[PDB]
Design a protein around this ligand. Sequence first.
Ligand SMILES: Cc1cc2nc3c(=O)[nH]c(=O)nc-3n(C[C@H](O)[C@H](O)[C@H](O)COP(=O)(O)OP(=O)(O)OC[C@H]3O[C@@H](n4cnc5c(N)ncnc54)[C@H](O)[C@@H]3O)c2cc1C
Ligand SMILES: Cc1cc2nc3c(=O)[nH]c(=O)nc-3n(C[C@H](O)[C@H](O)[C@H](O)COP(=O)(O)OP(=O)(O)OC[C@H]3O[C@@H](n4cnc5c(N)ncnc54)[C@H](O)[C@@H]3O)c2cc1C
Lengths: 339, 339
Amino acid sequence: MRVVVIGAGVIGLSTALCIHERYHSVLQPLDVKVYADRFTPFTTTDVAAGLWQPYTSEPSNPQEANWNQQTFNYLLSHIGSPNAANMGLTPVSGYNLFREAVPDPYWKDMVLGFRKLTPRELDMFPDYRYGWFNTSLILEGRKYLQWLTERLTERGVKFFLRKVESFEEVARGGADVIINCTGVWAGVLQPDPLLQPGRGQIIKVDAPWLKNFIITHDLERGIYNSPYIIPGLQAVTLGGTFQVGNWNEINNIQDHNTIWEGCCRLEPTLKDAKIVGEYTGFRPVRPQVRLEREQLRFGSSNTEVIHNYGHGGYGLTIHWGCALEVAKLFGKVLEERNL
Amino acid sequence: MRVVVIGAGVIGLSTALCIHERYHSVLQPLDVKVYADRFTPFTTTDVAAGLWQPYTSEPSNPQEANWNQQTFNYLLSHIGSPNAANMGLTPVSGYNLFREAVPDPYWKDMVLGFRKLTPRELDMFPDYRYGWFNTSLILEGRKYLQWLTERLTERGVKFFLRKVESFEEVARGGADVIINCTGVWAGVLQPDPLLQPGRGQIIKVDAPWLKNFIITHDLERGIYNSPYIIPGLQAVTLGGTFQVGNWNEINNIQDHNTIWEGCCRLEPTLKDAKIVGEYTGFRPVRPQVRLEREQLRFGSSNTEVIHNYGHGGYGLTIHWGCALEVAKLFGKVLEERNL
Ligand SMILES: Cc1cc2nc3c(=O)[nH]c(=O)nc-3n(C[C@H](O)[C@H](O)[C@H](O)COP(=O)(O)OP(=O)(O)OC[C@H]3O[C@@H](n4cnc5c(N)ncnc54)[C@H](O)[C@@H]3O)c2cc1C
Ligand SMILES: Cc1cc2nc3c(=O)[nH]c(=O)nc-3n(C[C@H](O)[C@H](O)[C@H](O)COP(=O)(O)OP(=O)(O)OC[C@H]3O[C@@H](n4cnc5c(N)ncnc54)[C@H](O)[C@@H]3O)c2cc1C
């Protein structure tokens, strides 16, 4: 059947692969195509700090906790292959610092080695007073997007640079099923007032001596509104901004300065780091991932649409669980159509 | 007074600085000079993997344990300054893997976060069956040697490229005190059958995605005779050889192959690493650090000699404790001479 995925960010590509991986065998004819108006390096995914770490607060949908877990185990299963770095993966250990005691995250047990910092540890970070340590994984968005792209391409999936104006337009094109993985732009194909851009700028820097991630938190100020430093495969990502409702896509000088000075304070050796670039992107903020099936009549054609968007500051961290869930709904769509 | 340090490896330079730092104030005249036939990048120190980690077994002279501890705290005290990376320092977390249970090292409490690996952790390293994890520090020998060198130079200490033939030769040159920090070559100035070269080759590689150290152990085969990978500031050090009594200073292809294949098996992603160089050096192996004062009559001149050599595979790890001890003996020499 004709299936069309709209989106080429981590959600779209992982989902496409996930399904094709499960159904090519079963459905003889299984035509996947991917439409997107932006491919890496232009997706929001390419801008991601690259770390696997859910929010500190519990999720609204409890399945989100599963999805996160399934994603981590799936990623860990690759640690050990010769390809892990080629897919954009590597373990990284690091700190979560806070200004005051805070309850353990629901994810303490998903990551490896979770534990509270000791005082000699905290002495390395004077403004903070409570914190955790745990090892997790890095999944660079750009590298991972390219990897999924080659995998998809070899499985025969086709890509097309296109801006979709409506699902109708796609249904008319003969799509039996359509997977919406439009990220913050999903509202355009169909309004969702719950969805909003969580803008964030980052500064990429060359500072190889930094081997661990460090993430600061300011409870008053909101998540990701505080300095964080996260080593990646080739460079370090400096960061710190999450602004809901802001659509400005231009890097701004003010954000740059606050991110730089904050990090520079937290890790003074940054003094010698070479800045390699700055970027801004929109977390697709929503109270809960919208992941559900919906049918659409276009005259005489029910065309299923399965949504998968609204991942906020955690799309990398949970993409696999969602891709699986979508495969499952797609499974139902198949049994209704009688395979 | 005239003081002459023989050696420009980590032991000689740290010791010189240590003393000058303590006595320049007190002794009005305090003439330090450093003689060495090899300066960085030619010392054994420049070849060090760069990690702070004592042996797994406990020391013979118990003071070694304190020297190690004093060294770690001294190093940690710098984590936080803007200069830490310039001195060659950065924290690094990592694994010690073994083929069977083993008792906790006497140093578990000196390092940060020591703990035993869990099974999900061990699944990332299939040949191994027991292990630890802890964060420690990297101190790159080459960078640190250059840093100490600038510090010494600015304090007015003088350097001279000179092969010393005998202490006599130096005493005749008017040295009131002489600090022997000759490493494996100390036997030449005065025989010590306990001292032997622990040869070791390493391969430097460019593989920035590796953020944690990994050190393997084979009990039958001896310490450091097993693959280990240790990220440094700019490159990764691959290693694995410790051969007592071997004086071959030439890198050999057999060692290279075994080190490469072993590491490559332990971390398959090395498949894509660029090799940047290979080097070999001699750990100054001895059952215990020789650190003691000895007087020497050269006709009518007692000339004190204070030895500090025999640090094996742990000179970086303990250099500061020793430098302090030497300053202390030097202190006595001063009170005997009545300041
Ligand atoms: C600065 C920053 C740091 C972050 N760090 C992390 C992190 O460390 N860890 C983590 O887990 N998460 C992180 N995130 C969150 C993560 O980046 C997002 O959750 C995730 O990238 C969303 O992916 P997506 O595919 O849904 O969106 P995108 O990657 O933006 O993909 C959307 C795709 O849909 C296409 N598209 C949209 N509308 C149309 C249309 N009308 N027609 C055709 N194509 C269309 C776009 O071209 C693009 O191809 C971060 C985000 C930001 C901004
Ligand atoms: C491959 C390898 C990996 C290692 N990794 C680590 C590690 O990760 N961590 C750790 O703690 N330790 C490590 N070590 C051990 C550490 O390298 C040695 O303990 C330490 O470098 C010894 O320093 P030193 O100053 O005593 O010797 P050197 O640095 O070799 O200094 C000796 C100095 O004396 C000079 N000299 C000698 N004889 C004379 C003479 N007759 N006249 C004039 N000058 C003379 C030499 O030119 C040189 O200047 C490692 C060693 C090796 C070989």
